[PDB]
Amino acid sequence: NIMNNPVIGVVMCRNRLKGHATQTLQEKYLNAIIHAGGLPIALPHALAEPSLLEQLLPKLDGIYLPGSPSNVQPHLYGENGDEPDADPGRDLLSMAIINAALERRIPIFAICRGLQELVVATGGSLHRKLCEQPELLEHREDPELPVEQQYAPSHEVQVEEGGLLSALLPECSNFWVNSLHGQGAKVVSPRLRVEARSPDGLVEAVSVINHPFALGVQWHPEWNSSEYALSRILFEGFITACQHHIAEKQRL
């Protein structure tokens, strides 16, 4: 691309490899940003410190919340108990950087866990076990199938008109998405607008009202994003918003 590439801050996840706590970022989340024209930089959880975060935000043109096997701690939306696979450090950074980016009108694109981070950060709640709700489809992947089958198309979603997805996808009101999540949106705050739903009524995409571009999707558009026309448009729209944010940063 003949392009100045906006700086995209990518929230990392925590893992432990060979005896050491490690900050990680899957390459497929990176490849999708690159293909769309972004300049990604990975953000460790230590940056959640307020004095460091305030110094970094002016240098970020967009915030990128990847998915992850971990689930948000239930106490962050007022519930008791725990769930398997927690990442309290990512929770800390995600909540802080979302709230900061929403006040600074920095574009946000959130995937799977990121959407759930968006819902919780703005006052919503999550279903902790979608499989325990009889009215819903099976939104989880089959973990014993190979990776390619896990990210294959799983169910359809229907776009709710009047939001970001309608502007980005004028023709498509309905399309196929993959599904790899055992948790999902339960209560969505009035600060958020519903963007799409699976045929069982589950919210699969949201966006922040009165924000230029704060979009979350429950599926995984980063999966071979260059090969999927719909995934390409979503990342293209995110980068275009960051370009607009750069241009808007000189009309303040």
- Binding residues for its own copies, rule: CB under 8 A, are 4-5, 7, 12, 14-15, 17-28, 30-31, 34, 39-47, 51-52, 55-56, 59, 69, 147
What does the alpha-carbon distance between residue 186 and residue 8 come to, in Å, rounded to a whole number?
29
Report the residue number, 69 or 123, with the smaller CB distance to its own copies. 69
Among the listed ranges 73-81, 123-131, 133-141, 208-216, the one in contact with Mn ion (CB under 5 A) is: 133-141
Active-site annotation holds for 248: no
Which two three-digit tokens encode residue 38?
């972004």
- 55 touches which of Mn ion, its own copies, none (CB within 5 to 8 A by kind)? its own copies
CA-CA distances (angstroms) from residue 191 to 2, 65, 140, 158, 209?
A: 37, 19, 27, 21, 6
At which residue do the structure tokens 């260059």 appear? 226
What does the alpha-carbon distance between residue 235 and residue 227 come to, in Å, rounded to a whole number?
12
- 36 touches which of its own copies, Mn ion, none (CB within 5 to 8 A by kind)? none
Active-site annotation holds for 220: yes
Name the residue type at position 223.
W
What does the alpha-carbon distance between residue 157 and residue 160 come to, in Å, rounded to a whole number?
9
Report the residue number, 139 or 245, with the smaller CB distance to Mn ion. 139
Residue span 168-187 as binding mask against Mn ion, x where in contact by CB under 5 A, dash where not: -----------x--------
Catalytic machinery residues = 112, 220, 222
